[PDB]
């Protein structure tokens, strides 16, 4: 299968570096171009630069062009993007991605066609806030709403389930924001029949933490 | 090169022949891309060349190109195709995307079911308050909520949120979150979201006495 797999997720400070990395498979890997692409949380997509692995000809977007090195290791097919002084606004999915060529076999590409094939992201997610455990809030009510609120934590994500996966019908959990604090805040919401009148199941990965609070 | 896509959202059905437009500032030649992308999915390619049909994808996606302007065309809606759009010119460096086009679920209109969520004492004895309003299971997906604190208008101190479009029912459900200092909390009586949606004749106020 013809296929780019990307380097786990990252959790960086600002000023840190950090290397990601793309590894082709399944196809000539010094015979394309790889791209690098990013998407900022809720943003579309932008072209940062492109790597021929076969020689480290490498093109930068002026917007990127001294903030990343695009390098590759042709040995091992990987392609790199490096950043020597992480900015909070680099807090970003990064893509890369294949340029189309019909034949491969002819030894020089011209320059880079549509992406074809695409790795699955890498996020990179940068703050100066350390890791932290939400602490979680009831949100007290023929219909009542309920809910939990999920607040004050870092970085993503928090899971949400309602009486141990048992209540499922009605559950809204929504996606965090990123609070001015730097920290991330969440609901998780539930509509049942007043009639019936609850628990909310909250981990937190990162930082080791369950909680499972009644809302009454 | 500025890729301007149209329209910025599209509400259609199974079995809808759908267009979606992408204009280039400049000629780009035939240089233009056509991606499809589902929420925390990588982009798969569509188009390339402007009406090559990239391997593997299925024939009822077609592009096609007047000058500057790039069209694709969906012929028969699957449920599948529902998705993010992005075109993108390759004809000259920098390579440069289109702003995306969202292709929603058509439903019926759906007025929103308020509620309002005032702090938990918990939450009081941290020095922070949060308003919480709900908009449940309503559409289309405009709608607007402004928070009321003893009658003034409050600007700067919500942040809100928005699921994607339900899986069973193609609703929206909307969650504001007004954050206040409790000092700021205390010193007032009455708080309310006023919430304006098509489904609703007039916007409705929920509210609540500290």
């Known amino acids: 299968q013809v296929q780019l797999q990307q380097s786990g997720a990252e959790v960086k400070k600002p000023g840190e570096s950090l290397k990601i990395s793309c590894k082709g498979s399944?196809?000539?890997?010094?015979?394309?171009?790889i791209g690098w692409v990013r998407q900022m949380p809720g943003k579309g997509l932008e072209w940062m630069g492109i790597?021929?692995?076969?020689?480290?000809?490498?093109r930068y977007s002026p917007s990127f062009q001294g903030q990343v090195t695009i390098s590759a290791d042709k040995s091992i097919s990987t392609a790199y993007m490096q950043w020597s002084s992480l900015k909070a606004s680099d807090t970003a999915m990064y893509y890369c991605?294949?340029?189309?060529?019909?034949?491969?076999?002819?030894?020089?590409?011209?320059?880079?066609?549509?992406?074809?094939?695409w790795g699955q992201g890498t996020m990179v997610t940068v703050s100066s806030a350390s890791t932290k455990g939400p602490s979680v809030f009831p949100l007290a009510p023929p219909t009542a709403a309920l809910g939990c609120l999920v607040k004050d934590y870092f970085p993503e994500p928090v899971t949400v389930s309602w009486n141990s996966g048992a209540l499922t019908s009605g559950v809204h959990t929504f996606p965090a924001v990123l609070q001015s604090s730097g920290l991330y805040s969440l609901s998780s919401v539930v509509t049942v029949p007043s009639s019936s009148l609850y628990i909310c199941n909250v981990n937190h990965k990162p930082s080791n933490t369950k909680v499972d609070k009644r809302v009454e | 090169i500025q890729m301007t896509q149209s329209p910025s959202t599209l509400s259609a059905s199974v079995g809808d022949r759908v267009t979606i437009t992408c204009r280039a500032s400049?000629?780009?030649?035939?240089?233009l891309a056509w991606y499809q992308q589902k929420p925390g999915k990588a982009p798969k390619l569509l188009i390339y060349?402007?009406?090559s049909l990239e391997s593997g994808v299925p024939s009822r996606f077609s592009g096609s190109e007047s000058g500057t302007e790039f069209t694709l065309t969906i012929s028969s809606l699957q449920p599948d195709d529902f998705a993010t759009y992005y075109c993108?010119?390759?004809?000259?460096?920098?390579?440069?995307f289109g702003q995306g086009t969202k292709l929603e679920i058509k439903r019926t209109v759906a007025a929103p079911s308020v509620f309002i969520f005032p702090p938990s004492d918990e939450q009081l004895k941290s020095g922070t308050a949060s308003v919480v309003c709900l908009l449940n299971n309503f559409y289309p997906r405009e709608a607007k909520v402004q928070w009321k604190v003893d009658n003034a208008l409050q600007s700067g101190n919500s942040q809100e949120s928005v699921t994607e479009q339900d899986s069973k029912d193609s609703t929206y459900s909307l969650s504001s979150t007004l954050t206040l200092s409790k000092a700021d909390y205390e010193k007032h009586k009455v708080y309310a979201c006023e919430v304006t949606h098509q489904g609703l004749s007039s916007p409705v106020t929920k509210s609540f006495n500290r």
């Open positions: 991605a294949r340029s189309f060529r019909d034949d491969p076999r002819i030894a020089v590409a011209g320059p880079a066609d549509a992406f074809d094939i």
């Open positions: 060349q402007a009406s």
């Open positions: 790597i021929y692995p076969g020689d480290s000809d490498t």
């Open positions: 993108q010119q390759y004809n000259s460096y920098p390579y440069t």
């Open positions: 399944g196809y000539s890997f010094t015979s394309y171009w």
């Open positions: 400049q000629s780009i030649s035939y240089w």
